[PDB]
């Protein structure tokens, strides 16, 4: 026979011409029976065909083909401790994926691959099978079913040749656990290669730190029982003796810092050898040379051991190289923020000799700025340059601020409008902008605050504030309580240190009052102001224009801007009357937050947060009641109703205005009041002191993808507000609101979330210490700072 044309039939996917030209006996040659057999073999060699049958007639051949592709889908079942994605990766690495050839030869290869994976994750006894579904189409999907074997358990960790230290004491530092105590099970007992290597390194480091310079791990054997249930691990140790560090010797290119290096390498006599201190000395020399510009020094320790005296001499070689310079400083990831916003926090300058301390200071300032979720730095060498580096800062911007608005109809406050635009980094310009506005049947409140944190290049800040707050207790009849206030505040701040700042500003406030229900404290203040309104009726009015000199001091050394784990922040805020104002008083408020990390990973943090306040009048007057302090709620004492902690009003018997007898009134003469009244109406006090003690724990069920966006803690709150001008000698039958001893206490669970809507705070609290007249609020919700 010869070949002229091939009539393939059933050739589903591969080209007919490609199949024609694949066979080495191409068109235009003689064809024997062995040539036809070789043609069948070569067609089978493609790996796509499971059946090849050829019929011959002279110069023409026809081939019948059946197709092995495709895999329609890959599914996994039976897994209970592993996901499916690493299994799919293992299949893809094995050469099997969706859309390719489903060769029946590779089924056992898949079985062995899954068996080897479970061998590698310590579940050797796993049993695995494959199932394929016969679809009518040429595509067929597969279903992997496997019974995961019982995990091979660690049965004994043994150490041979240890004599100075107890075996269990040596084991106690290993990540692999010999046994788990049943009354405080906090872990499990499993084998893994990297954990075993880390435990061996921990054992080496422990023996080296306890003075055994010539310590050696002779051999290690891991063995498993014939039933595949237990694993035995043993380590052989020749520990040697303890070696005393006779002294150090520094030699090399010290670059003129020999005195500081020698102070770094100070050794007291009789000190035992220890590799942690050797490494600490090496790293300290590296840091010392780096902060002078020597970015890449070579430091190697070459100890010499004298076995006769059991002493070691710690020779160390230092080569500082050359001083490095910063060619450029680059910022990556600032999609919204200006370049200057990040660059003005820098302490390293472009076109100057490098300082690693300066780079770290810039990173810390960027972290304290609070605009970025993560801040990372990279000092990379300039290619083709021996003594120049590029400093690159890579940041991930955080969703600073929140924008709110709301509309209501026919509700408790009638038709209602509200809107709030809080934004710490306005459009990436660094400006802090805060807009708040409400309009309901009772309040028409607007407030605008805009602050530039860098009014000059040195960090001087300029800021302002406008507010208008008009309150009416009733929409009609004009004779109910009215409290209209407006005013302006301008502030100036400047830095005095790397962590300390001072503020100084001028404020003006106008406050107008009318038709206030008579009260002991408020009429005490009104008598102090020289006003003499009557207690028999609600008809009264008052009006003040006040100019205040504002001042402040802020110490801020927090680790970060939004969820700190270290450092403290102390903010003092005060104001004093400028002469010529109607009210004469002073006011001072003190904030404190201290973060103490217990675990080196900074996942467990103790936060001690206190807030103090005080204010009083000057020259015989008293501090206005609009400057009072209030406590309770998310900000100060969680678990209590907001602003309800503190002094409560004591009313006088008076002819109430806008009286309608089907409602409840505070002690009207026409309702029948004859004497003064105890109430639960919070009015605040001139003195305030709250404290809290938070214990921050990692969120148990949130993965590392969103772990930095959520914080949960267990808190304990204290706080009290009292009125230092109360006179219990006159009002003996009423509670002593001058007493600061009425500390209100609470405990509970708090959860904070950096939501895309803004900072959200959840808190459930139990006010276990509570006085009469206090309103509790177990579940509390707050949006923002």
């Amino acid at each position: 026979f010869v070949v002229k044309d091939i009539h393939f039939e059933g050739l589903q996917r591969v080209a007919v011409g490609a199949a024609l030209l694949s066979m080495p006996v191409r068109t235009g040659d003689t064809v024997n029976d062995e040539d036809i057999s070789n043609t069948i073999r070569a067609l089978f060699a493609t790996g796509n065909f499971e059946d090849v049958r050829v019929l011959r007639d002279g110069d023409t051949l026809l081939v019948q083909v059946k197709e092995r592709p495709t895999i329609a889908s890959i599914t996994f079942s039976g897994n209970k401790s592993v996901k499916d994605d690493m299994l799919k990766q293992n299949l893809e690495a094995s050469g099997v994926r969706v859309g390719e050839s489903l060769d029946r030869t590779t089924i056992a290869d898949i079985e062995k691959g899954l068996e080897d994976f479970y061998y590698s994750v310590g579940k050797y006894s796993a049993s695995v099978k494959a199932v394929v579904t016969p679809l009518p189409r040429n595509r067929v999907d597969l279903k992997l079913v496997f019974q995961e074997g019982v995990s091979a358990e660690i049965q004994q960790i043994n150490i041979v040749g240890n004599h100075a230290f107890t075996t269990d004491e040596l084991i106690s530092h290993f990540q692999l656990r010999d046994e788990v105590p049943w009354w405080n099970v906090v872990g499990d007992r499993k084998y893994q290669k990297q954990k075993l290597a880390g435990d061996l390194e921990t054992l080496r480091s422990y023996y080296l730190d306890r003075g055994y310079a010539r310590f050696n791990i002779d051999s290690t054997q891991v063995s498993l029982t014939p039933d595949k249930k237990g694993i035995y691990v043993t380590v052989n140790i020749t520990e040697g003796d303890q070696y005393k560090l006779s002294g150090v010797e520094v030699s090399g290119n010290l670059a003129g810092h020999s005195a500081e290096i020698e102070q770094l390498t100070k050794i007291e006599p009789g000190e035992l050898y220890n590799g942690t201190k050797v490494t600490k000395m090496e790293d300290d020399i590296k840091k010392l040379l780096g902060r002078y510009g020597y970015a890449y020094p070579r430091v190697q320790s070459m100890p010499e051991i004298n076995d006769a005296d059991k002493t070691v001499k710690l020779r160390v070689n230092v080569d500082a190289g050359n001083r490095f310079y910063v060619r450029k400083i680059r910022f990556e990831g600032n999609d919204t923020s200006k370049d200057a916003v990040l660059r003005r926090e820098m302490r390293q300058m472009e076109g100057a000799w490098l300082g690693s301390d300066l780079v770290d200071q810039g990173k810390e300032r960027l972290n304290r700025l609070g605009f970025f979720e993560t801040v990372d730095t990279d000092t990379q060498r300039v290619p083709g340059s021996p003594d120049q580096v590029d400093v690159v800062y890579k940041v991930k911007e955080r969703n600073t601020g929140s924008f709110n608005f709301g509309i209501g109809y026919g509700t408790e406050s009638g038709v209602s409008f509200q809107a709030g635009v809080q934004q710490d980094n306005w459009l990436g310009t660094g400006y802090a902008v805060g807009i708040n506005g409400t309009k309901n049947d009772y309040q028409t409140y607007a407030e605008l605050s805009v602050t530039n944190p860098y009014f000059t290049v040195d960090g001087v800040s300029l800021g302002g504030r406008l507010f208008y707050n008009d309150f009416q207790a009733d929409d009609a009849d004009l004779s109910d309580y009215t409290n209209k206030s407006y005013g302006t505040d301008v502030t100036l701040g400047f830095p005095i240190n790397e962590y300390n700042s001072l503020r100084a500003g001028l404020g003006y406030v106008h406050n107008s009052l009318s038709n206030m229900q008579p009260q002991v404290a408020m009429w005490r203040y009104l008598y102090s102001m020289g006003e003499h309104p009557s207690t028999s009726d609600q008809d009264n009015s008052f009006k003040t224009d006040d100019f205040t000199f504002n001042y402040g001091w802020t110490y801020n050394k927090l680790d970060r801007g939004y969820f700190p784990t270290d450092g403290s922040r102390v903010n003092l805020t005060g104001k004093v009357t400028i002469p010529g104002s109607d009210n004469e008083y002073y006011k001072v408020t003190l904030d404190t937050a201290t973060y103490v990390p217990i675990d080196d990973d900074h996942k467990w943090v103790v936060l001690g947060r206190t807030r103090w306040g005080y204010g009083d009048g000057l020259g015989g007057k008293e501090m206005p009641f609009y400057e009072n302090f209030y406590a309770g709620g998310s900000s100060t004492v969680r678990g209590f109703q907001s602003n309800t902690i503190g002094p409560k009003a004591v009313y006088f018997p008076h002819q109430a205005s806008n009286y309608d007898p089907d409602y409840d009134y505070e002690c009207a003469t026409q309702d029948g009041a004859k004497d003064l009244c105890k109430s639960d109406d919070a009015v605040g006090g001139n003195a305030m002191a709250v404290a809290s003690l938070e214990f921050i724990t990692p969120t148990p069920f949130i993965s590392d993808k969103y772990a930095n966006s959520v914080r949960t803690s267990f808190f304990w709150d204290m706080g009290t507000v009292w009125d230092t001008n109360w006179d219990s000698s006159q009002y003996s039958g009423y509670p002593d609101y001058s007493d600061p001893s009425n500390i209100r206490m609470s405990a509970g669970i708090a959860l904070q979330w950096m939501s895309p809507l803004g900072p959200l705070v959840f808190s459930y609290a139990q006010p276990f210490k509570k006085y009469d007249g206090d309103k509790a609020e177990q579940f509390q919700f707050n949006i923002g700072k």
């Binding site: 929140s402 709301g406 509309i407 209501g408 026919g410 509700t411």
Partner: peptide, 15 residues
């Protein structure tokens, strides 16, 4: 994101 109940509407700008 926004919610409405008892004829009161509040909306939060997200992102």
């Amino acid at each position: 994101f926004g919610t409405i109940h008892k004829r009161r509407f509040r909306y939060w700008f997200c992102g």
